């Protein structure tokens, strides 16, 4: 593939997921690349009924960015402490090697704003030869 995720999927590293989720109230859960689409899920702490969960993504080293709405997905077996939101983002026909593709996650609820920015580095998608 000419594109890989430059980070481990948090759902495969539960101890790291749990720490970040408890601290930030939002954390990326799944992320995968298939056929120039990036898809995944986000877990949020259930602090209010109405929620706005977005991926903020750049394809040009933050010269510009797009906010993409995530969609609530009820788990029939889920609890009430957290909620899961999905996203699906089509990638550009070609992506840069000289610029960076990076994203982070925002969560608006209860008059508060929470973010997952991967410890200040954002989540990077890198090119492969
Ligand atoms: O019935 C009481 C309820 O009535 C009013 O709410 C109605 C609202 O005004 C309508 O617009 C519509 O809701 C739509 C909504 O406006 C849209 O934005 C969208 O909603 C999405 C959410 O934004 C998104 O967060 C997610 O929602 C899921 C939650 O994430 C998840 O946690 C769970 O929600 C449960 C709450 O966590 C829990 O607290 C409890 O909610 C109570 C509220 O806290 C309380 O304020 C009151 O709610 C009023 C509301 O204020 C009125 O405006 O009572 C609630 C019940 O006790 O229970 C929640 C449900 O289990 O689940 C939700 C998904 O159901 O996804 C949604 C969907 O995309 O779409 C909404 C639906 O069209 O209808 C509601 C009434 O149903
Ligand atoms: Na919403």
Short mmCIF file of C-alpha atoms and ligand atoms in Angstrom, two decimals:
data_model
loop_
_atom_site.label_atom_id
_atom_site.label_comp_id
_atom_site.label_asym_id
_atom_site.label_seq_id
_atom_site.Cartn_x
_atom_site.Cartn_y
_atom_site.Cartn_z
CA UNK A 1 0.00 0.00 0.00
CA UNK A 2 1.24 3.56 -0.59
CA UNK A 3 -0.34 4.82 2.65
CA UNK A 4 -0.03 3.67 6.26
CA UNK A 5 -1.17 4.91 9.64
CA UNK A 6 1.84 6.25 11.55
CA UNK A 7 0.44 5.15 14.93
CA UNK A 8 -0.94 2.00 16.60
CA UNK A 9 -4.71 1.53 16.68
CA UNK A 10 -5.72 2.49 20.25
CA UNK A 11 -8.19 -0.42 20.42
CA UNK A 12 -5.21 -2.78 20.11
CA UNK A 13 -3.44 -1.02 23.02
CA UNK A 14 -6.09 -0.96 25.73
CA UNK A 15 -3.86 0.28 28.54
CA UNK A 16 -2.91 3.34 26.48
CA UNK A 17 -6.50 3.83 25.33
CA UNK A 18 -7.86 3.70 28.89
CA UNK A 19 -5.36 6.26 30.20
CA UNK A 20 -6.04 8.78 27.43
CA UNK A 21 -9.81 8.24 27.47
CA UNK A 22 -10.14 8.84 31.22
CA UNK A 23 -7.97 11.96 31.01
CA UNK A 24 -9.37 13.61 27.87
CA UNK A 25 -12.99 12.27 27.78
CA UNK A 26 -12.53 11.36 24.08
CA UNK A 27 -10.18 8.94 22.38
CA UNK A 28 -9.76 7.42 18.95
CA UNK A 29 -10.68 3.73 19.12
CA UNK A 30 -10.33 2.26 15.61
CA UNK A 31 -8.74 3.61 12.47
CA UNK A 32 -8.10 1.84 9.20
CA UNK A 33 -7.23 2.70 5.61
CA UNK A 34 -8.91 0.91 2.74
CA UNK A 35 -9.13 2.05 -0.89
CA UNK A 36 -8.31 5.72 -0.20
CA UNK A 37 -10.85 5.99 2.62
CA UNK A 38 -9.94 6.38 6.28
CA UNK A 39 -12.60 4.96 8.59
CA UNK A 40 -12.76 4.39 12.31
CA UNK A 41 -14.51 4.97 15.61
CA UNK A 42 -14.20 7.36 18.54
CA UNK A 43 -15.19 6.71 22.16
CA UNK A 44 -16.53 9.63 24.24
CA UNK A 45 -17.51 9.92 27.88
CA UNK A 46 -21.29 10.25 28.18
CA UNK A 47 -21.56 13.70 29.77
CA UNK A 48 -24.79 14.83 28.04
CA UNK A 49 -27.37 13.62 25.54
CA UNK A 50 -26.56 16.02 22.69
CA UNK A 51 -23.01 15.58 21.39
CA UNK A 52 -20.97 16.88 18.46
CA UNK A 53 -17.99 14.69 17.54
CA UNK A 54 -15.77 15.73 14.64
CA UNK A 55 -12.53 14.74 12.94
CA UNK A 56 -10.43 17.80 12.13
CA UNK A 57 -8.13 16.71 9.30
CA UNK A 58 -5.51 18.39 7.09
CA UNK A 59 -3.94 17.14 3.87
CA UNK A 60 -1.48 20.03 3.49
CA UNK A 61 0.41 20.54 6.78
CA UNK A 62 -2.42 22.63 8.30
CA UNK A 63 -2.50 25.24 5.53
CA UNK A 64 -6.19 24.22 5.43
CA UNK A 65 -8.35 21.74 7.30
CA UNK A 66 -11.80 20.15 7.18
CA UNK A 67 -14.13 19.26 10.06
CA UNK A 68 -15.96 15.98 9.39
CA UNK A 69 -19.00 14.99 11.44
CA UNK A 70 -18.91 11.61 13.19
CA UNK A 71 -22.10 9.57 13.50
CA UNK A 72 -23.42 7.98 16.69
CA UNK A 73 -23.57 4.18 16.52
CA UNK A 74 -25.55 2.52 19.30
CA UNK A 75 -24.11 -0.77 20.53
CA UNK A 76 -27.02 -3.07 21.37
CA UNK A 77 -24.70 -4.51 24.05
CA UNK A 78 -23.24 -1.15 25.11
CA UNK A 79 -23.38 0.60 28.47
CA UNK A 80 -24.22 4.17 29.49
CA UNK A 81 -20.76 5.35 30.60
CA UNK A 82 -19.42 5.88 27.07
CA UNK A 83 -20.69 6.30 23.52
CA UNK A 84 -19.17 5.35 20.17
CA UNK A 85 -19.13 7.48 16.99
CA UNK A 86 -17.99 6.40 13.52
CA UNK A 87 -16.31 8.32 10.71
CA UNK A 88 -15.49 7.71 7.05
CA UNK A 89 -13.30 10.19 5.15
CA UNK A 90 -12.32 9.98 1.49
CA UNK A 91 -8.67 10.75 0.91
CA UNK A 92 -7.31 12.97 -1.88
CA UNK A 93 -6.44 11.22 -5.15
CA UNK A 94 -2.76 11.85 -4.31
CA UNK A 95 -1.39 12.81 -0.90
CA UNK A 96 1.87 14.65 -0.13
CA UNK A 97 5.21 13.27 0.93
CA UNK A 98 6.59 16.80 1.47
CA UNK A 99 3.53 17.89 3.47
CA UNK A 100 1.74 16.05 6.26
CA UNK A 101 -1.67 14.37 6.57
CA UNK A 102 -2.75 14.66 10.20
CA UNK A 103 -5.99 14.58 12.15
CA UNK A 104 -7.38 15.09 15.63
CA UNK A 105 -10.80 14.68 17.25
CA UNK A 106 -13.06 17.28 18.87
CA UNK A 107 -15.99 16.58 21.18
CA UNK A 108 -18.54 19.25 22.15
CA UNK A 109 -21.01 18.46 24.94
CA UNK A 110 -22.58 20.08 28.00
CA UNK A 111 -21.01 23.45 27.15
CA UNK A 112 -17.55 21.88 27.29
CA UNK A 113 -15.00 21.03 24.60
CA UNK A 114 -12.74 17.96 24.72
CA UNK A 115 -10.02 16.90 22.29
CA UNK A 116 -7.91 13.88 21.36
CA UNK A 117 -4.77 15.21 19.67
CA UNK A 118 -2.52 12.17 20.25
CA UNK A 119 -0.43 13.82 22.99
CA UNK A 120 0.04 17.01 20.98
CA UNK A 121 1.28 15.27 17.82
CA UNK A 122 -2.05 14.61 16.04
CA UNK A 123 -2.61 11.29 14.25
CA UNK A 124 -0.43 11.08 11.13
CA UNK A 125 -0.98 9.21 7.86
CA UNK A 126 2.29 8.76 5.97
CA UNK A 127 3.27 7.79 2.44
CA UNK A 128 5.10 4.56 1.65
CA UNK A 129 7.25 3.82 -1.41
O1 LIG B 1 -36.90 12.26 25.52
C1 LIG B 1 -36.33 13.23 26.36
C2 LIG B 1 -35.55 14.25 25.51
O2 LIG B 1 -36.48 14.94 24.69
C3 LIG B 1 -35.92 15.93 23.85
O3 LIG B 1 -34.97 15.30 23.03
C4 LIG B 1 -35.37 15.14 21.66
C5 LIG B 1 -34.64 16.16 20.80
O4 LIG B 1 -35.09 17.46 21.11
C6 LIG B 1 -34.92 15.89 19.31
O5 LIG B 1 -34.21 16.76 18.48
C7 LIG B 1 -34.52 14.42 19.00
O6 LIG B 1 -33.16 14.24 19.27
C8 LIG B 1 -32.35 14.31 18.11
C9 LIG B 1 -31.20 15.28 18.41
O7 LIG B 1 -31.62 16.61 18.59
C10 LIG B 1 -30.13 15.22 17.30
O8 LIG B 1 -29.07 16.04 17.66
C11 LIG B 1 -29.63 13.75 17.13
O9 LIG B 1 -29.07 13.32 18.38
C12 LIG B 1 -27.86 12.58 18.33
C13 LIG B 1 -27.07 13.00 19.56
O10 LIG B 1 -26.62 14.34 19.43
C14 LIG B 1 -25.87 12.08 19.83
O11 LIG B 1 -25.26 12.43 21.06
C15 LIG B 1 -26.35 10.62 19.90
O12 LIG B 1 -27.28 10.53 20.96
C16 LIG B 1 -27.10 9.35 21.79
C17 LIG B 1 -26.28 9.70 23.00
O13 LIG B 1 -24.94 10.02 22.60
C18 LIG B 1 -26.26 8.54 24.00
O14 LIG B 1 -25.57 8.89 25.14
C19 LIG B 1 -27.72 8.13 24.38
O15 LIG B 1 -28.32 9.24 24.92
C20 LIG B 1 -28.88 9.02 26.19
C21 LIG B 1 -28.29 10.06 27.16
O16 LIG B 1 -26.92 9.82 27.36
C22 LIG B 1 -28.99 10.03 28.53
O17 LIG B 1 -28.56 11.15 29.28
C23 LIG B 1 -30.52 10.10 28.36
O18 LIG B 1 -30.89 11.35 27.81
C24 LIG B 1 -31.77 12.17 28.60
C25 LIG B 1 -31.27 13.57 28.41
O19 LIG B 1 -30.03 13.69 29.09
C26 LIG B 1 -32.25 14.65 28.92
O20 LIG B 1 -31.87 15.94 28.56
C27 LIG B 1 -33.68 14.37 28.34
O21 LIG B 1 -33.62 14.49 26.97
C28 LIG B 1 -34.73 15.19 26.41
C29 LIG B 1 -34.13 16.33 25.59
O22 LIG B 1 -33.53 17.28 26.45
C30 LIG B 1 -35.20 17.00 24.71
O23 LIG B 1 -34.65 17.97 23.87
O24 LIG B 1 -34.05 13.03 28.66
C31 LIG B 1 -33.20 12.06 28.07
C32 LIG B 1 -33.82 10.68 28.31
O25 LIG B 1 -33.67 10.35 29.66
O26 LIG B 1 -30.96 9.10 27.46
C33 LIG B 1 -30.41 9.22 26.16
C34 LIG B 1 -31.11 8.23 25.21
O27 LIG B 1 -30.85 6.92 25.64
O28 LIG B 1 -28.42 7.77 23.18
C35 LIG B 1 -28.47 8.85 22.21
C36 LIG B 1 -29.23 8.36 20.97
O29 LIG B 1 -30.56 8.08 21.33
O30 LIG B 1 -27.01 10.28 18.70
C37 LIG B 1 -28.17 11.06 18.45
C38 LIG B 1 -28.83 10.47 17.21
O31 LIG B 1 -28.04 10.74 16.09
O32 LIG B 1 -30.73 12.94 16.83
C39 LIG B 1 -31.75 12.93 17.82
C40 LIG B 1 -32.86 11.96 17.36
O33 LIG B 1 -33.40 12.43 16.15
O34 LIG B 1 -35.27 13.52 19.83
C41 LIG B 1 -35.06 13.71 21.22
C42 LIG B 1 -35.95 12.71 21.99
O35 LIG B 1 -35.64 11.40 21.59
NA1 LIG B 2 -25.15 15.59 17.60
#
